[PDB]
Design a protein around this ligand. Structure first.
Ligand SMILES: Nc1ncnc2c1ncn2[C@@H]1O[C@H](CSCC[C@H](N)C(=O)O)[C@@H](O)[C@H]1O
Ligand SMILES: [Zn+2]
Lengths: 176, 159, 19, 8
């Protein structure tokens, strides 16, 4: 069963006993999921339960070497989508991607790694466009980074709140 | 009685970072050196790496010479499995060969999967360099690597 | 090389032996 | 196939 990882996480994150909800604490810190992917098309969802004033979230995929005490997308090992302004971050460079997301939004994360690799983000089921093309080769994990005490909840499947239309994938729960 | 092997092994993982260190060796290049006295028969370090089927060694060796890597870090478990530490491994990559080794390798069974673990053949004291007999298959006169282990009873070649 | 602490088991792809 | 070995 796929959860938020037990040790592979910044220790200041407040993770709930279910291992599916996480609260932030101070500066950007990361948590990865227990399972990762190396080939194929995979999907998972994140719900922003609570985003108080002056809180942000950068969500997406990370290789095992992504820095735990830094925002997702800080280095070459991760690609992220920022709640503030919808910016996309990779190697600490943020570029125009989409509109921002906030409290209550259910966000979608699609990756494709064929044996042409793609990262696509979803906002309440709607395709937000391709964010990254021909990404680095490696194992990619679902990952959450939070800047202060926001709360988000991750859903690996099997059933998603807003299954994207005409997209082929397997839920991350298949990994467990 | 004895400790259950999987407990021995976790203890190994937790402590081996603190007992061993990588330095330059008089034997060759770099090696693994004992940092605190290890008693005989104790686990020293696992030969960590990528576990592949035996049929994949010859393909990987050829692509390793396409990259010009000089030494081979593949270490055989049994007839059907080999640990490939060339691109993924731990400090055990640096354990040099000797003909009077203070360590030996043996295969262990932990939860169905198999590991290669380096055991202290004797009581090893701090400052010593850790070595084991590579036991390369003998080859012919060509492709023959001389052995500089400094042992009084050196075989004069690794293979 | 990339430093590692536990053994990883190589997962072969379907086309592992193909030209 | 020059792999190190545990035994002959
Ligand atoms: N006893 C010995 N004498 C000379 N060279 C040795 C040796 N034992 C190991 N080697 C060399 O070390 C390689 C194994 S990798 C071991 C680590 C190496 N000493 C390093 O500095 O990175 C072999 O290919 C061999 O060329
Ligand atoms: Zn010798």
């Amino acid at each position: 069963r796929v959860l938020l990882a037990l040790h592979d996480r910044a220790p200041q994150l407040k993770i709930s006993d279910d291992r599916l909800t996480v609260v932030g604490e101070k500066g950007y810190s990361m948590v990865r999921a227990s399972h990762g992917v190396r080939k194929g098309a995979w999907y998972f969802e994140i719900t922003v339960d609570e985003m108080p004033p002056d809180t942000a979230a950068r969500l997406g995929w990370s290789q095992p070497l992504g820095n735990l005490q830094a925002p997702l997308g800080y280095d070459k090992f991760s690609y992220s989508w920022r709640s503030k302004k919808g910016t996309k971050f990779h190697q600490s460079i943020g570029k125009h991607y989409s509109s921002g997301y906030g409290q209550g939004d259910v966000l979608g994360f699609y990756i494709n790694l064929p044996e042409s690799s793609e990262i696509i983000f979803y906002k309440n089921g709607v395709n937000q466009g391709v964010a990254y093309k021909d990404i680095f080769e490696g194992v990619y994990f679902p990952a959450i980074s939070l800047y202060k005490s926001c709360t988000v909840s991750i859903n690996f499947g099997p059933c998603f709140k807003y299954p994207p239309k005409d997209l082929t994938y397997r839920p991350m729960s298949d990994m467990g | 009685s004895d400790l259950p092997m999987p407990m021995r092994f976790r203890h190994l993982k937790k402590t081996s970072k603190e007992a061993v260190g990588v330095y330059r060796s008089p034997i060759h290049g770099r090696g693994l050196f004992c940092k605190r006295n290890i008693d005989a028969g104790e686990m020293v370090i696992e030969y960590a790496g990528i576990v592949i089927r035996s049929i994949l060694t010859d393909k990987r060796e050829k692509y390793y010479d396409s990259k010009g890597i000089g030494s081979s870090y593949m270490f055989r478990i049994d007839d059907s499995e080999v640990v490939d530490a060339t691109m993924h491994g731990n400090a055990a990559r640096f354990i040099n060969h000797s003909c009077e080794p203070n360590c030996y390798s043996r295969v262990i069974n932990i939860d169905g999967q198999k590991h290669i673990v380096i055991f202290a053949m004797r009581k090893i004291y701090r400052g010593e360099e850790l070595t084991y007999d590579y036991k390369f298959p003998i080859e012919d006169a060509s492709n023959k690597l001389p052995c500089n282990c400094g042992a009084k009873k050196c075989r004069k070649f690794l293979n | 090389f990339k430093e590692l602490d536990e053994n990883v088991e190589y997962e072969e792809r379907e086309s592992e032996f193909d030209i | 196939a020059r792999t190190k070995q545990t035994a002959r």
